[PDB]
Amino acid sequence: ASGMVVTDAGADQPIVFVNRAFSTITGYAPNEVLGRNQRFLQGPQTDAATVARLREAIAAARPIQERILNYRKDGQPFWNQLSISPVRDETGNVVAFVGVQTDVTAHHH
Amino acid sequence: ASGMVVTDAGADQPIVFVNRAFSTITGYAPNEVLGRNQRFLQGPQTDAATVARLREAIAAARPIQERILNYRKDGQPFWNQLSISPVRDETGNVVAFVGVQTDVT
Ligand SMILES: Cc1cc2nc3c(=O)[nH]c(=O)nc-3n(C[C@H](O)[C@H](O)[C@H](O)COP(=O)(O)O)c2cc1C
Ligand SMILES: Cc1cc2nc3c(=O)[nH]c(=O)nc-3n(C[C@H](O)[C@H](O)[C@H](O)COP(=O)(O)O)c2cc1C
Q: Domains of chain A (ranges plus CATH)?
């Protein structure tokens, strides 16, 4: 099951919703992450160029997909196949962002 | 400001999230709508053909826009410029649906 998050469109994109699979993948309960920017999933081995691409895409409200190294609440690394899309109304205003997270790590084999 | 709703993909698409503007437009609070199908916004003069077009697009996970007559909690009719999009993972599975509601009355 893939994680899904909704964030606000404005002012550093606080989380406003996560699905159950997001908790399964990340180790965080919904109420521990509401109101926060998703960058808390990053850590020292996260690729800075990837993060830069995300930063520029979100600022421009452009869809973006990346495979990014993230970290569970407990510190356990996982590779995140991440897809972010703006949600627009019919006059083009960005209402929110949606993010999908798939854990693509081979954890056990 | 436009309303936004997120539903689950299966099991008759219950609401799992609404934004502030959804409540401004519709008169329902989040707690009144979570877990329900969005069709509670329809009423007596809602166009049946429009509803069927939405039904088919959701079943096929196809994006669709309709101008549909809906009803505020207090029963007042309003024209809903509605856009629905599937949310997919990178292998194509539908994870959720997103709806965007503009009151264009
Ligand atoms: C909807 C949404 C979901 C996001 N999900 C993730 C994620 O799962 N993992 C991640 O490392 N960053 C994720 N981000 C990106 C970070 O929140 C942040 O935008 C990125 O690190 C670039 O900003 P920064 O350089 O200011 O940290 C997400 C962003 C948005 C808008
Ligand atoms: C994300 C999402 C948002 C929806 N928003 C609305 C809405 O604002 N108004 C509406 O009349 N129907 C809306 N619908 C459509 C109804 O939920 C339902 O799918 C439609 O009436 C056709 O199905 P039915 O014949 O089973 O009722 C939405 C559906 C989804 C999946």
A: 6-103 (3.30.450.20)
